[PDB]
Amino acid sequence: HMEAVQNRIVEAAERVPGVRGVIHLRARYVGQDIWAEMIIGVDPENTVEQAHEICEAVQAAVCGKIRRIESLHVSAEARE
Amino acid sequence: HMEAVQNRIVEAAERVPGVRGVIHLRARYVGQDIWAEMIIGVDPENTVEQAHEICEAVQAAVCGKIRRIESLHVSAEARE
């Protein structure tokens, strides 16, 4: 039942400035730990550097809030 | 291991305007559900009515964020 933990990931990520939705989220248990990969939407007119900053902020916010996550890979794609 | 869920309760409650710490928190599992009681600190010069409003806001915020909670009793005491 991954719904609860994935809902928490999505909520945490959406609250980070510059996130235009969670496009993709894959999470899996590795023992009691979560390993996850996610794609966030960002403003197509943000720079590549800004998108990298948003990704890093999402990684921090999500790992900060969901303590069981032991790996979180975040990438960005243009949305709207 | 109640630490993770109790940390989440405390954090959620502290982010509600007017909460001056969590004085007490007791949480227990009733099957897969959490039942909890908590005491929040509030400004001694808030009115009784305001303290009741803060308690209700904490109940909403905490239940909103921690979906496994199926009962949450919140009371208030003067702090500082």
Curated annotation (Swiss-Prot), chains A, B:
Residues where Fe cation 3 binds: 77
Organism of derivation: Magnetospirillum gryphiswaldense (strain DSM 6361 / JCM 21280 / NBRC 15271 / MSR-1)
Protein name, as recorded: Magnetosome protein MamM
Disruption-associated phenotype: Single gene disruption has no growth defects, no accumulation of magnetite, forms empty intracellular magnetosome vesicles, decreased levels of MamB, mislocation of MamC in 1-3 foci or rarely in a shortened chain. Magnetosome vesicles are fewer and smaller, aligned in a chain with the filament, only a few have very small crystals. Other, possibly precursor magnetosome vesicles are visible. MamI mislocalized to cell inner membrane or in 1 to a few patches.
Residues of the full protein shown: 215 to 292 of 318
Region ranges (C-terminal domain (CTD)): 3-80
Domain comment, as recorded: The C-terminal domain (CTD) is probably responsible for hetero- and homodimerization; it assumes a V-shaped, dimeric metallo-chaperone-like fold that can open and close. Val-48 forms the hinge between the dimers. Binds up to 3 divalent metal cations (probably iron in vivo); upon binding there is a conformational shift to a tighter dimer. If the CTD cannot fold correctly the function of the whole protein is decreased, suggesting the CTD confers functionality on the transmembrane domain (TMD), perhaps activated by ligand binding to the CTD.
Outcome (variant: residue 48 to G): Nearly wild-type magnetic response
Subcellular location as annotated: Magnetosome membrane; Cell inner membrane
Record-stated family: Belongs to the cation diffusion facilitator (CDF) transporter (TC 2.A.4) family.
